[PDB]
Design a protein around this ligand. Structure first.
Ligand code: PNM
Length: 503
């Protein structure tokens, strides 16, 4: 009996269950008595009396009850997975030929729910043996797999209440923007526990609908050009190095890099503005400037020290390292605002954690334990671990003040992320998406990966929410303008209420 998969609070995300399959013996070959038949005689009337319990298709049933030289028949999917009452109901009616075989099915109480984390187990029909095909099911299969030995349970950090907030919000963003890719992740700011994680498009582990359309888990196995969320790590390196003074002025506008003209987003700039306002506006010239002040060799190192270009070493299979793009000054200067370099969303959460743990990066984790439920032996137990301390408490407190302004500055271009009654901070991102098949960047009206790396309450946050949407195929203009504010706001507002945060 395959092990359970539980959430933070012992609520069930996957379990084995006893269901029943319907079998009808149609062929008259059980004729040792016409008075005591063991096959289906009146087809019309046998068909009608189980319509009362099954899908109620008396014609489709009577149709299927008519085949060629087959003793037994099944009724595909609507005649598998039937309750223990559905058995006793059909057994009371004493129909001849009709029996119900027991079947052990894998059952996901919440259906489409953390589907790409939890994964799916598939049944060998010959043995009823279940094998994990993706996610926790696949990773921890040997632990979950079971004279009759009962398999070990896997406990996640996922909180079913928060996971719901995330599932509703991403459901809305698909109706509004129908994007090619989309994800949101809630993490405990102070522990690095994944409290909630979802992505679209995804599958239903229960029904199996859409399974194997996308193998890739967004949090761990998919890489992105992060965009301007990645500026927080460059700003931290610059604050530590001395390059960044919020009140010093810099020449905004553009820079000429290996002959190409990389410019601020409004193209003109704002002339000489303070570096604080530079960041608040998301000036690429500020970041290319700070890179010149600090040094190309010193900045590759600073990115490496924030955990980039190498795997977080988490519990997920085939975790992507990504890569720091640093082969020519065009790659380095574009890396400063999160193009060329590829990240995993989990790398970004590891990095971002440093601003709230006095400079200590938290290794993010979702598996809480693997225990036998009889013996109570923990074969594995996860905990808060430090992944690096790339910056000082001071650097961190100052990166925080900039993230506060990005949202709450009177000249903010990101007030769409404010939440009535809770103070929020973070950094926005709009980024070009590499074309799957070489061909530089995806073309179109606004062919962007919009993203936000927020946290609340500000300075001493309970949670970090990192949502990202890639290539909205509808309201693509509103996508560019609002990014992921329509997912961030509800996810964050409901998660703070549920953790009883004041206001
Ligand atoms: C960071 O990713 C920056 N993005 C770019 O410079 C690329 C870009 C994409 C669309 C339009 C113009 C430029 C800055 N990040 C976003 C943001 O802060 O939301 C901006 C569009 C302001 S530029």
């Amino acid at each position: 009996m395959r092990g359970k998969i539980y959430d933070r609070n012992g609520k069930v995300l996957a379990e084995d269950v006893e269901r029943y399959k319907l079998v009808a013996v149609i062929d008259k070959k059980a004729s040792a008595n016409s008075k005591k038949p063991r096959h289906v005689v009146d087809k019309k009337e046998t068909a009608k009396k189980l319509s009362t319990v099954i899908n109620m298709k008396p014609e489709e049933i009577e149709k299927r009850l008519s085949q060629k030289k087959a003793f037994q028949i099944e009724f595909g999917r609507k005649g598998t997975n039937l309750t223990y009452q559905d058995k006793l109901k059909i057994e009371k009616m004493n129909l001849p030929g009709i029996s119900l075989l027991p079947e052990t099915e894998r059952f996901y109480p919440n259906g489409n729910f953390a589907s790409h984390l939890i994964g799916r187990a598939q049944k060998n029909p010959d043995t009823g043996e279940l094998k994990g095909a993706l996610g926790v099911e696949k990773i921890f299969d040997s632990y979950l797999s079971g004279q009759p030995k009962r398999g070990d349970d896997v406990h996640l950090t996922i909180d079913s209440n928060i996971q719901v907030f995330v599932e509703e919000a991403l459901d809305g963003m698909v109706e509004r923007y129908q994007p090619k890719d989309l994800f949101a992740v809630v993490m405990d700011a102070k522990t690095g526990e994944i409290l909630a994680y979802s992505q679209r498009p995804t599958f239903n582990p229960e029904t199996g609908k859409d399974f194997g359309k996308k193998w890739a888990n967004d949090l761990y196995q998919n890489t992105y050009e992060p965009g301007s969320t990645f500026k927080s790590y460059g700003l931290a390196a610059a604050i530590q190095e001395g390059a960044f003074d919020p009140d010093k002025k810099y020449k905004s506008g553009h820079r000429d890099i290996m002959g190409s003209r990389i410019s601020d987003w409004n193209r003109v700039g704002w002339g000489e503005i303070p570096m604080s306002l530079g960041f608040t506006y998301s000036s690429n010239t500020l970041m290319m400037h700070l890179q010149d002040l600090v040094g190309a060799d010193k900045m590759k190192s600073w990115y490496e020290r924030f955990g980039f270009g190498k795997s977080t070493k988490g519990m997920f299979d085939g975790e992507a390292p990504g890569q720091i793009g640093w082969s020519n000054e065009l790659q380095q200067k574009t890396s400063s605002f999160g193009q060329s370099t590829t990240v995993t969303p989990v790398q970004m959460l590891q990095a971002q954690s440093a601003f709230f743990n006095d400079g200590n990066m938290l290794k993010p984790w979702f598996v809480n334990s693997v225990e036998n439920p009889v013996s109570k032996r923990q074969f594995y137990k996860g905990q808060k671990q430090i992944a690096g301390k790339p910056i000082t408490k001071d650097t961190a407190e100052k990166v925080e003040k900039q993230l506060d302004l990005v949202v709450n500055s009177k000249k903010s271009h990101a007030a769409n992320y404010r939440i009535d009654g809770y103070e929020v901070e973070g950094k926005t991102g709009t980024a070009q998406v590499a074309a799957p098949n070489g061909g530089g960047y995806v073309k179109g009206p606004n062919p962007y990966f919009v993203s936000f790396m927020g946290d609340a309450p500000k300075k001493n946050p309970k949670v970090i929410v990192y949502a990202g949407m890639s290539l909205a195929q509808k309201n693509d203009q509103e996508a560019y303008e609002l990014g992921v504010s329509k997912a961030f706001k509800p996810i964050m507002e409901n998660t703070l209420k549920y953790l009883n945060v004041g206001k």
